[PDB]
Design a binder for this molecule. Sequence first.
Ligand SMILES: Nc1nc2c(ncn2[C@@H]2O[C@H](COP(=O)(O)OP(=O)(O)CP(=O)(O)O)[C@@H](O)[C@H]2O)c(=O)[nH]1
Length: 169
Amino acid sequence: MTEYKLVVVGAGGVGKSALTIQLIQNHFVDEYDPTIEDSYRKQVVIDGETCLLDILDTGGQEEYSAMRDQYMRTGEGFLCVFAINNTKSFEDIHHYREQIKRVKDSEDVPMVLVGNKCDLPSRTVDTKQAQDLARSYGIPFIETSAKTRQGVDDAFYTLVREIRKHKEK
Ligand SMILES: Nc1nc2c(ncn2[C@@H]2O[C@H](COP(=O)(O)OP(=O)(O)CP(=O)(O)O)[C@@H](O)[C@H]2O)c(=O)[nH]1
């Protein structure tokens, strides 16, 4: 049973918690709307291997986090989440990636670009835009919806697979 330290980053309001809660929910509680950063666990089987995922639901750059730097040192992979109807949240991706490279002193950090809220017909960030940005970073791009659960599990599974590939380099 391998452990993976996952960290979700992005501007506030993009759906970092909705994604994390939908992934880890055992649904004992009907509704859970966390506003404070926290860590969640889920045991999942990926490609036959039982994985133990620790997912850190970080707050946006606005919310102060004393352990932010340490969270990124411990983190092995990062979900960079933006909202396809929020152009600023998409532009903010550069800030969060630079923040990760600054602390980990590397350009080869496992990451996945996540365009959340793909359930909304009206979007401002085209698929080509995000796919192009992901290419410039050398990381995968996945569209997700924390409402319809579209691509939610695949986003985290993809990141785990990115960590495993990186670790086997
Ligand atoms: N239509 C739609 N709304 C979404 C989706 N994901 C989240 N939302 C909505 O966006 C708002 C912000 O969600 P939230 O999970 O708090 O995002 P956040 O600010 O990145 C997470 P936190 O700040 O707690 O780390 C909420 O009203 C939520 O219902 C989605 O996939 N589709």
